[PDB]
Amino acid sequence: LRPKLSEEQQRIIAILLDAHHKTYDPTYSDFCQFRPPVRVNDGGGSVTLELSQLSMLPHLADLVSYSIQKVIGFAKMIPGFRDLTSEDQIVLLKSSAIEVIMLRSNESFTMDDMSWTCGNQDYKYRVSDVTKAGHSLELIEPLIKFQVGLKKLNLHEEEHVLLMAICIVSPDRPGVQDAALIEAIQDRLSNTLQTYIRCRHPPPLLYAKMIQKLADLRSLNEEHSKQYRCLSFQPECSMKLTPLVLEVFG
Ligand SMILES: CCC(CC)(c1ccc(/C=C/C(O)(C(F)(F)F)C(F)(F)F)c(C)c1)c1ccc(-c2ccc(CC(=O)O)c(F)c2)c(C)c1
């Protein structure tokens, strides 16, 4: 059965698309305002050398801190998000931040050479750039695999904005107080996404693949948290981060 999208579901999609268009820059025009990327010789991928230099950390921390601010703005526009207590809103944003960033970064990701391409060679990011920020292969290798699998879904922008919203409004995040309200908000979004796929996505299982990507994001989130903790132990690391990054991941 292929029910039509209701007037409410149409309204939810239009709000999320408008929210995304106002909070995501496909021209990466603010990147010149971040602390500059610095790339040093690290062919071997030496953990000791990367931790001693963290050459790409100020730039990548700025990239993530900037994206968190945009995610905060996007979330405020999600239907029902403002009905939650401020406490539940902050818990949801903090716990989903890196996951949402991983979804948002897919637009700049290219399979032509397996990089996030955001302009000239300066704003072109590969596996080596993430390792230069103090992260290790247990995160970056499944991260590239995630980016490819996600890119291959060829998501409509409507499905992309619904997936980010569903990711943020998750009742199974630790520290949430009103899980039932969060679940009702998420179910309204999930039903919108499911209805949308069934009547707008042409042939040739997409919904189940999108749900699996959400489970993949949980694994990546946990590994990122473990890696951020190691990184935070490096002396003088806090100056290479930002106050927002310190709060969200600390
Ligand atoms: C460089 C790869 C990646 C992939 C998701 C990334 C960037 C930083 C970190 C790691 C972060 C940190 O752990 C750090 F700094 F400590 F090492 C922490 F989370 F704590 F900050 C990680 C794992 C991945 C990234 C993120 C956002 C954008 C990206 C794409 C597009 C846009 C434009 C827009 O959103 O409007 C954008 F701002 C950013 C781009 C192009 C790449």
Question: 26: domain range?
Answer: 1-250
| H helix and E strand count, the chain | 10, 3
Name the residue at shortest CA distance from atom 25 of ligand 1.
105
Provide the residue type at 80 as one letter: G
Q: What is the resolution of the experimental data for this entry, in Å?
A: 2.0
Instruction: Kindly state if the Cβ of 116 falls inside 6 Å of ligand 1.
Output: yes
- Residue 161 to residue 23: CA distance in whole angstroms: 11
Long-range contacts formed by 66-72: CB under 8 A, 24+ apart = 66/30, 66/34, 67/100, 67/101, 67/104, 67/105, 68/93, 68/97, 68/101, 68/244, 68/245, 68/248, 69/244, 70/23, 70/24, 70/104, 71/23, 71/96, 71/97, 71/100, 71/101, 71/104, 71/168
60 touches ligand 1 (CB under 6 Å): yes
Report the number of distinct structural domains present in the chain. 1
189 C-alpha vs ligand 1 centroid, how far in Å? 26
> Both tokens of residue 128?
């080596």
Number of Cβ within a 10 Å radius of residue 9:
18
Q: Are 170 and 96 in contact (CB under 8 A)?
A: yes
For residues 129 and 43, the answer to whether their CB atoms sit within 8 Å is no
Indicate which CATH number applies to the domain containing 81: 1.10.565.10
